[PDB]
Curated annotation (Swiss-Prot), chains A, C:
Protein name listed in UniProt: Modulator of FtsH protease HflC
Family: Belongs to the band 7/mec-2 family. HflC subfamily.
Organism for this UniProt entry: Escherichia coli (strain K12)
Residues spanning the signal sequence: none
Gene: hflC
Intracellular or extracellular location(s): Cell inner membrane
Known function: HflC and HflK help govern the stability of phage lambda cII protein, and thereby control the lysogenization frequency of phage lambda. HflKC inhibits the SecY-degrading activity of FtsH, possibly helping quality control of integral membrane proteins.
Curated annotation (Swiss-Prot), chain D:
Gene name per UniProt: hflK
Protein name according to UniProt: Modulator of FtsH protease HflK
Family: Belongs to the band 7/mec-2 family. HflK subfamily.
Disulfide linkage: none
Source organism (scientific name): Escherichia coli (strain K12)
Location of this chain's protein in the cell: Cell inner membrane
N-terminal signal peptide: none
Functional note: HflC and HflK help govern the stability of phage lambda cII protein, and thereby control the lysogenization frequency of phage lambda. HflKC inhibits the SecY-degrading activity of FtsH, possibly helping quality control of integral membrane proteins.
Residues of the full protein shown: 316 to 352 of 419
Note, other: Integration of this protein into the membrane depends on SecA, SecY and SecD but not on SecB or FtsY. HflK is unstable in the absence of HflC.
Quaternary structure note: HflC and HflK interact to form a complex, originally called HflA, now called HflKC. HflKC interacts with FtsH; complex formation is stimulated by ATP, and with YccA.
Superkingdom of the source species: Bacteria
Length: 50, 90, 50, 37
């Protein structure tokens, strides 16, 4: 804990972003899931006309 | 005969307790060493990665964002449906 | 990472575009994924009468 | 940079043609209604 605390206190936001993405990766590993988006969301932005 | 066989059990069971006790202690020591070394590895990797992000902030990100979302949508069944929906009593 | 940054800092929008269009191909790769749409949506606009 | 719109349009069409050739589809008017798996 001491080592980590001395580590990450240079940019709180970046350590927040990372170590969260790897959480999603390691959590959604199992195929058992189902997920209901909406086409007007953000990640699927580039699916409209142009 | 029963009394002496019970005495044999009494004199035999106790040492293996010392055996297993030493084993559990040594396994705890191994855990300690492994945890601290992994901590050093992670801190070093982040230390190396940070400055190049403090070089170019905006495009360091969206690449990482997309690269994680590719896998997160990789392994989940998905049902794309429009919104304004009312109810879903499966 | 720095090589990526120096390369792709030429035009952000085009990179985002092409990278998303290549992520889509790998995402929905042989998996049951129902999709409800309208003939009034964007992409099917040439199914109308003229 | 030579000609943006035409290459952009062609890329859109090609990639979505590939993506819609793997996913099952049901095409219904979405003016009102609801359903469950």
């Amino acid at each position: 804990a001491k080592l980590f605390a001395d580590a990450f206190s240079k940019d709180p936001d970046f350590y927040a972003f990372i170590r969260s993405l790897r959480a999603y990766e390691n959590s959604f590993s199992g195929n058992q899931d189902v997920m209901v988006m909406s086409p007007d969301s953000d990640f699927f932005r580039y699916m409209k006309t142009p | 005969q029963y009394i002496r066989e019970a005495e044999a059990y009494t004199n035999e069971v106790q040492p293996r307790a010392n055996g297993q006790a030493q084993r559990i202690l040594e396994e705890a020591r191994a855990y300690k060493a492994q945890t601290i070394l992994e901590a050093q590895g992670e801190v070093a990797r982040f230390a190396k990665l940070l400055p190049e992000y403090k070089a170019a902030p905006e495009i360091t990100r969206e690449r990482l964002y997309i690269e994680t979302m590719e896998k997160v949508l990789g392994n989940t069944r998905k049902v794309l449906v429009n919104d304004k929906g009312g109810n879903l009593m499966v």
